[PDB]
Nucleic acid binder design. Structure first.
Ligand code: NA
Ligand code: NA
Ligand code: NA
Lengths: 102, 95, 94
DNA sequence: TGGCGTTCTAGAATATTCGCGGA
DNA sequence: ATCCGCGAATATTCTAGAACGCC
């Protein structure tokens, strides 16, 4: 049985209604979160028992997701991207192979 | 020498202009952050090289501050007291 | 995984828009920085969290870059124009 | 049971700053 | 006396540890 987090993350990323806040990348091999503040307060509590980005990020790391760093970050001058080799658009069956860390 | 984080943290908490986002508790044992999103994007980059709440929280734990369990986030350190800037000398950064 | 500093420095040197301040040498085995002060105040903070030339140089030394003795020229044997793949072999000091 | 979810804190690698020492 | 390269402390980012609850 696929854990609730992966099925919920799949649904909310794929949901076109939330695409303004969280959506697939063009390749469908990663997902973006735009405006962490709005995402955390409107989307997270509709799937999880919290509205905290840190608790969402902790879960992403627990399931082998890693942050994709953009070369545009790092300067003094809101787009957060995460990926997992088995989290691909149009391949929901692949979530069976994402195993949570012990 | 007191590290920049502590003097900046004392300054921004004590600043009455920011009291709507971050301010001392009534007794002044601790400080509250209201609306993490607006605080992180509007107050943090004016003191630090980032606008991210997670890096602020990481630094707080780095200096031994702990979250008091109850958008209202409260942190305390026994040597972070309103009107006692000299006490920051006793706050130890973890190595 | 190649550290941000090396990828950013590669972009900075190779970027033709910044060539007036930082660019490859003609042979492409080193890079020059012209007007160290102006470089520090306008190009550095758009790539790093500082506008400080000393902090740019400190990281260059952390990655084994050496100053070319003769505005300001730096070199690393694996920082070569047209060989971006070589940045994988630059090790940061411990 | 034991694996999962949420929270709060810490580890690890790189980044930025300051100042110094030997050449 | 100057200056390049470096040690060390702090800063920022991303990931992980640890405690506890709960079906
Ligand atoms: Na979506
Ligand atoms: Na304040
Ligand atoms: Na250039």
């Amino acid at each position: 049985h696929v854990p609730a987090f992966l099925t919920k993350l799949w649904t909310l990323v794929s949901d076109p209604d939330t695409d303004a806040l969280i959506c697939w990348s063009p390749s469908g091999n990663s997902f973006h979160v735009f405006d962490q503040g709005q995402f955390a307060k409107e989307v997270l509590p509709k799937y999880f028992k919290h509205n905290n980005m840190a608790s969402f990020v902790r879960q992403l790391n627990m399931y082998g997701f890693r942050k994709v760093v953009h070369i545009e970050q790092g300067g003094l001058v809101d787009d957060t991207e995460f990926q997992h080799p088995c989290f691909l658009r149009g391949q929901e069956q692949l979530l069976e192979n994402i195993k949570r860390k012990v």
